[PDB]
Structure formats: structure tokens, C-alpha cells
Write a protein that binds this ligand. Structure first.
Ligand SMILES: Cc1cc2occ(CN(C)CCN(C)Cc3cn(-c4cccc(C(F)(F)F)c4)c4ccccc34)c(=O)c2cc1C
Ligand SMILES: Cc1cc2occ(CN(C)CCN(C)Cc3cn(-c4cccc(C(F)(F)F)c4)c4ccccc34)c(=O)c2cc1C
Lengths: 129, 141, 140, 132
């Protein structure tokens, strides 16, 4: 009965990383954000896949970050890659103490580079400890 | 009441990778302590241990840049520093900025009082400009 | 793609813990070998390693019975035997007793590493039925 | 896309360990058994919790085993087994390993003493597979 979530990205969304409604024991998906049903320790994780065709002239940075909106806002986890056909994953994860009704966003800078070749390989989840 | 920790690099500590718990969304719970820049395990057990360090440089002056990241254990009973996890990266094969995140994770039998270090060789390439980019944590299983 | 193994004790080997792949439902796939009673890793990587041993005795003649189970790694460039996982049990504090010992963890391994899973008391080993003593790895 | 299952025991079954109907990507539960939808390497795991009050004169042995029913090869063997001798006591038994399975193979997770099952914690008696 411990809160758990695992949302996957909508491949058919336009210029957005958008999460599709596992969402169990009180975790909600609202406003593209995971809402935590109770205070406690949560493992938070995500994976986004990026792909591109060759290397252009403007230098490509790929960013991915998980943020906590404490209903204050702050970056929990963030990573950046500089890919310059190329393929890059960015993973994030850790344990955090969260408050009831906190909201969690997992965001990127370049939705156009998203790689939906493998289904459900772009995800975001939490598991309460 | 599982021991758990998640510490983050100190963005005011130049030329060092210094871990902090006293930040919003860094964590020491249920007995894990941070002392002398090391996580101290409060009780014997199985622990998932993980880290991410973000390296960044401006251009490649040399092909010989080598970035290392390691997590090691020091046991009270066997004062030797023993590596648990390590990775090495060569970011420069040949002036725009390169980024190289290094991730370490594994599941280890740890003893009461073990000290866990997470270290790098090049704190001048460390990127803690934004929060969330350099971290080190453990979860008792 | 990933290297994987799951080996089981030889019920015909008395006084030892001898692993087998050549049984129905034991496995060596994608490069893992079993040689000199050890699993040999085919490539550098992160590996979940696990074992279960079932010990069984008939009564407690002594409170000093001690059961150990360990998994060790021998690296080509190191040659020192280094413990990855270990447990100890004292079954007799004072009829058959049973003590399953479970080991599990996730380790960085190199090409050619040799993994050993051993016990101190093969006379207490219970491989009467299948599935009771096993040792495996899964590349992650 | 990879087959996965995790079924939990029915706390209201009589004199039996009975799995309730995730169950995705082709895994089925049929005749109290998980059925594999494709050939491949599977992680198989389970946990059963037993509990009892004090220790009697009859010696309590608790067994738990996972079996592979190979349908076309027509044979049936234990994949994983363990035994505990508990003699208010509490005992878990875990099982797990990686196995190569064939399409339509059926998997059972069985015990010897359903009367000792401990349903005190709801989501703690379970049986699952994860295709690699
Ligand atoms: C902190 C961290 C350490 C890590 O260390 C090792 C690996 C390599 N692997 C375990 C297999 C390759 N992967 C991509 C798997 C993976 C591993 N983790 C992971 C591993 C350990 C600890 C955590 C955390 F959530 F607890 F912080 C996550 C993932 C989280 C999200 C998506 C994928 C993963 C990682 O991928 C990794 C990822 C992260 C985020
Ligand atoms: C082979 C084996 C090794 C093991 O080594 C370590 C532990 C100790 N722990 C991780 C404490 C937490 N547990 C009891 C949970 C647990 C750990 N495993 C587990 C761990 C490693 C490998 C596997 C396997 F599925 F790959 F075989 C299972 C479970 C399988 C089913 C139900 C529960 C578990 C185990 O419980 C364990 C269980 C098993 C079955």
C-alpha cells in the first residue's frame, strides 16, 4: 500500500515531454507532474532517450532535470550531455524526503530530439520506501 | 527505519568535491552520518550505493584529459581503502563545451561504521553550476 | 544479449559443493563459462550475483556448529581471492533443523573474473530435492 | 514489450495458496500457474510469509517451491526450493533465479502448509516473473 508510480512519455505529443497515465496507492498525475500522497522517503527516477542525425553547426546541449515543487521549487536531479547518427540516454535517480502533496516534474530542453524508437524507454517514476 | 542518505556537492567549495547534507533535498536519515566528507554506515546490512558526477570542460586542449570517479569503502576492522565502484572517461578525442556525466551504482554488504567515499580526480571539471548534478547516496535494503 | 548463468549443486558429489550447468534448468548463456567450479565472466560489466544454499542437520550435538556461505571474486590482474558476499549462521542454540543461506548483491566485474560460491560444511548441504542450492549472475 | 507478472496470494482462500489476478505483455494466470508467452530468459521470484503461535509437539516443516511445467516436453521439475524449521514465530521463504523457458511453459509456486500462511501484511505473499 506504499505509493508507487511509473509514467511513460506520450510519443504523439507536440513539442513537449508529456507523461501518460502505473499510478498506485495515492500517487496522481496532474499538470504533467507526479503528486505525492504522503510524507516520506521516495526513490525518484527517470530516463529520457535522445537521438539525432549527424552533427550540425549550432552546438547541441541536451538537459534533463527532475524538480520538486513543495506546495518553493528546486532541482532534485539534473544531467547534461553534449552529443557532438547519435544516441544518448540521460538517467536520473536518488532518494528524497518528500511532503504530502508535493509535485514532481521531469523535464527536458529539447523535445524534438526525443527518441521514441523503443516504446516505454522514456519514463519517470517514484517508489515510496 | 532504513538507513538512507543522499548528499550533494558544495558549489562554494572550489577545487574540491565536498558533500553536503545541510541543503534542501539532501538527506541523512536513520543513522547515516556524514563526517570528514564520507558517509558513515550506522549498522551492518545490504546497501544500494549510487552516485552521479557531472563533468564539464570548454574545448579539448589535449587528447589526454582523463576523468575518474570512484566510490570506496573503509572498514573499521580492515583500514584499507577498497574500491567498490569506479569509472574512467576520456572526454577529448581531439572551442565548445563538452559534458560527461559519470554514474556509479551497485549493491554491497556493508558493516557498522564503514566509511564510504565518493571521489573524482578533476574537481576543476566538476560542474555544480546548477543543483542536482553531483550527488552520492545509499539505501539500506 | 546479456551474460547470465544459474548453476546448481551436484547431488552426486558427496563432501563437496560442485556446481553444474548440464542439468535441466541450469543455465550458461551469452559467454559465461563454468570452469574449475567457478563462473567465468565473459565481459566487463555490472552484474547482479546471487546464491542460495540449504543446510540441513539432524539434531544439535553441539552449540558450536557454524555454517558459512560466501561468494568471492578472483580477478586476472589481482589473483587475490576477495569476498563479495558472506553470511554465517549458528543453527544450534542448545529433530531436523534447516537453514537456508541467501546471498545477493550487484558488483562491477571484469572480463575473466572468476566467481566462487563456497560453504564450510558440505556434510550439512541439503541437495536431496532439486532447486535447493544454486548460484547465478545476471549482467545488467 | 517484455513479459512480466507479479501475482499476490488470496487472503480468503481455503487450505490453499491461490494467486490473484501486474500480468502484462502476454503472461497469463491459468490453473494457479503463470504461463509464459514466449521463449526466453526469465527472472523468476517469489516470497511466502509463514507465522505460528508457540511451538507444538509435532515438528513443523515449512516448504516452498517453484516448478516448471514444460508443456510440450511433457516433464515437470523443481526450479527453486527451500525449507524452514521454525521450531509467536515468523518465517519468510524467498526464491529466485534466472531460467530459460519455452513458449507455453507453466510455472507454479507452491507450499506445504497453507494454514501457516501469514496475511498480516497484505502485499507480501507474491510470485512473479520478468523476461530479460
Ligand atoms: C545515480 C545513478 C547511478 C547509476 O549507476 C549505474 C547505472 C548502470 N545500470 C544500473 C544499468 C543501466 N541503466 C540505465 C539502469 C539504471 C540504474 N538506475 C539506478 C541505479 C542505482 C540507483 C538509482 C537511484 F534511483 F536509486 F538513485 C538508479 C536507474 C534509474 C533510472 C533509469 C535507469 C537506471 C545507471 O544507469 C545509474 C543511473 C543513475 C541515475
Ligand atoms: C537467491 C536469493 C538471494 C538473496 O540474497 C539477498 C537477500 C536479502 N535481501 C535482498 C533482503 C530483502 N529481501 C528478502 C528481498 C529479496 C531479494 N531477492 C532477490 C535478490 C537477488 C536475486 C534474486 C533473483 F531473483 F534474481 F534470484 C532475488 C528476492 C526475490 C524474491 C523475494 C524477495 C527477494 C535475499 O533475500 C535473497 C533472496 C534470494 C531468493
Amino acid at each position: 500500500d506504499k505509493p508507487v508510480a511509473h509514467v511513460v512519455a506520450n510519443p504523439q505529443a507536440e513539442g513537449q515531454l508529456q507523461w501518460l497515465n502505473l499510478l498506485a496507492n495515492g500517487v496522481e498525475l496532474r499538470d504533467n507532474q507526479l503528486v505525492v500522497p504522503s510524507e516520506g522517503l521516495y526513490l525518484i527516477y527517470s530516463q529520457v532517450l535522445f537521438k539525432g542525425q549527424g552533427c550540425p553547426s549550432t552546438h547541441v546541449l541536451l538537459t534533463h532535470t527532475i524538480s520538486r515543487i513543495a506546495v518553493t521549487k528546486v532541482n532534485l536531479l539534473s544531467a547534461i550531455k553534449s552529443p557532438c547518427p547519435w544516441y544518448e540516454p540521460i538517467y536520473l535517480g536518488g532518494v528524497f524526503q518528500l511532503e504530502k502533496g508535493d509535485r514532481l516534474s521531469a523535464e527536458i530542453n529539447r523535445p524534438d530530439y526525443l527518441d521514441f524508437a523503443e516504446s516505454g524507454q522514456v519514463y519517470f517514476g517514484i517508489i515510496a520506501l
